[PDB]
Amino acid sequence: ATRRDFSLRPEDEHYLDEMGYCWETRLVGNARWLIIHDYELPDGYNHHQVNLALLITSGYPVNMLDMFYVYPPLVRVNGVNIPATEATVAIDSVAYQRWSRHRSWNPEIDSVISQLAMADGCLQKEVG
């Protein structure tokens, strides 16, 4: 929550606040991480809350956002692995699961807002 090493777009921050998220911006070296704490998940996973993180790429929002990251790593409650989620990326030493989920990026309309909407859509989808 209180950690804010850098700014997003003014519209991003307004959206994250209007959503009532506990959110931080964390610089790790030169990498800019958005981390949403205790993001609530639908039922069907080994966990019901995660940290949901976006890597804010250099040149954002003309550079695209790509994929998303969660900690702890998610598995379906029946033990089946989520497809295309086998990589991990360390954020300040904590190993996040990286979801390989890709889409076209239009700088006039895409942002953290649409990237979090994609993340939620994937999380809803992969309960089964």
């Binding site: 777009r9 003309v62 550079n63 695209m64 006039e108």
Partner: protein, 448 residues
């Protein structure tokens, strides 16, 4: 030395309004953002045309128009304290009337200042489109605008102190009053910067983060072996070279990425940007500086792709160059696909991310090329600077707009041109916003 900058689109609309053909004065109001760096730049943003019908006493030398248009401009300008510039057809005589009071030109400028605490102004256009302007501080007459300019397909400079043919002393006199910025000072950029220095530009910004190595002694003008052995910064080397050539300290070296508040705020002061970089990310920054601060932009690139032939081995596929001219409010480098999000994305992965994600098959591999070579760099860089001359001092037998993009191949021995009117334009959200924060709309550049 200050500037009032109009886009070609607003200037064209303004001139039509002020000169409908009946030879009688008309009135309009330009609302401007400002950049207050080394010089004051007034950046034309919105235009209000006063309809002829709502005026009175419209003659060849006078016009009386209603004060509700003055209140509209104040209302547009209030939130961001924008500058308001009244514009009248040439003679320029006017008054502003309401039911209770008529107000002279001086009184109108006082009312503007009372409505918006900012510098305001009053301008006159003659029928052929040239403009003169005077600025008013705290509502009272102050100084003339040194330069009113429109970078269109042709680039126009209307000096307060006031056409020469290209390459004469009149051209040099113009360049002596201008500031050029060179972004990337290496293979093409050292050649652009050399030409800009010897052509007589009065101030030359040099922006690059990199240093000289033995490998670039085959290409970087003025560089020496000692430079390479001591890893001298490109911009510091070139600034010192300009100082000895021109006999005067007119260069401004910025040893930094263009993607920094330092470099963006310095380049915002320039009258022309020359972009000579080898990254998509820097071309995107230059594009957004140009739009935000209404600066014409020349972007140049060269490429020597290679491939492996079965019977010959590696060979030269092609030897190519590209010159792009971008005018404020015309199509951008983004519109032209000079960069895209995907290309920036792939470039700005680190080594391990790139290798790892190439394996996954969402990105594609970068293509192979031969080493850069001074002859090709010079062929492209000379045409890049000549493009600026041709737009300031037309000498071609065709309209400059036909040469908005130039592509040449020294292997195919062809050169092709693309007209501005063939390029689709997306919404340009940066146009004339100046330094609105976060700078360039990029949060990494924001002021915290």
């Amino acid at each position: 030395g200050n500037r009032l900058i109009l886009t070609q689109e607003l200037h064209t609309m303004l001139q039509k309004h002020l000169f409908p053909g009946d030879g009688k004065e008309a009135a309009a109001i330009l609302i401007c953002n400002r950049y207050e760096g080394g010089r004051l730049k007034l950046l034309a943003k919105e235009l209000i045309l006063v309809p002829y019908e709502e005026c009175k006493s419209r003659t060849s030398d006078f016009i009386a128009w209603p004060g509700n248009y003055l209140e509209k401009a104040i209302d547009v300008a209030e939130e961001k304290s924008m500058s308001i510039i009244l514009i009248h057809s040439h003679p320029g005589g006017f008054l502003v009337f309401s039911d209770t009071a008529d107000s002279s030109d001086m009184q109108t400028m006082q009312s503007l200042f009372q409505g918006v605490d900012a510098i305001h102004g009053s301008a006159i256009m003659i029928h052929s489109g040239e403009m003169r302007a005077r600025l008013y501080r705290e509502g009272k007459f102050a100084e003339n605008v040194e330069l009113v300019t429109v970078a269109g397909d042709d680039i126009h400079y209307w000096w307060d102190d006031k056409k020469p043919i290209a390459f004469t002393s009149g051209m040099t006199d113009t360049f002596q009053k201008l500031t050029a910025a060179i972004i990337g000072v290496s293979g093409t950029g050292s050649i652009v910067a050399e030409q800009v220095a010897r052509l007589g530009f009065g101030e030359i910004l040099l922006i690059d983060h990199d240093h000289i190595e033995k490998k670039n002694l085959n290409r970087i003008l003025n560089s020496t072996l000692k430079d390479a052995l001591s890893h001298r910064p490109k911009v510091d080397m070139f600034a010192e070279a300009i100082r000895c050539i021109r006999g005067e300290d007119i260069s401004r070296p910025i040893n930094n990425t263009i993607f920094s508040r330092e470099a963006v705020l310095a380049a915002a002061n320039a009258d022309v940007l020359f972009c000579c970089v080898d990254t998509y990310l820097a071309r995107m920054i230059a594009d957004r500086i140009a739009s935000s601060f209404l600066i014409p932009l020349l972007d140049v690139g060269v490429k020597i792709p290679t491939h492996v032939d079965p019977d010959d081995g590696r060979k030269i596929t092609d030897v190519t160059g590209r010159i792009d001219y971008v005018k404020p409010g015309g199509s951008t480098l983004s519109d032209r696909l000079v960069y895209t999000p995907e290309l920036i994305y792939r470039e700005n992965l680190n080594a391990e991310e790139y290798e790892e994600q190439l394996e996954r098959g969402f990105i594609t591999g970068v293509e192979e090329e031969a080493p850069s070579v001074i002859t090709l760099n010079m062929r492209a860089a000379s045409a890049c600077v000549s493009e600026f001359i041709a737009r300031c001092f037309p000498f071609r037998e065709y309209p400059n707009k036909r040469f908005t993009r130039t592509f040449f191949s020294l292997a195919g021995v062809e050169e092709d041109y693309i007209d501005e009117s063939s390029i689709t334009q997306a919404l340009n959200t940066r146009l004339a916003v100046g330094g609105e924060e976060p700078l360039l709309g990029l949060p990494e550049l924001g002021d915290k």
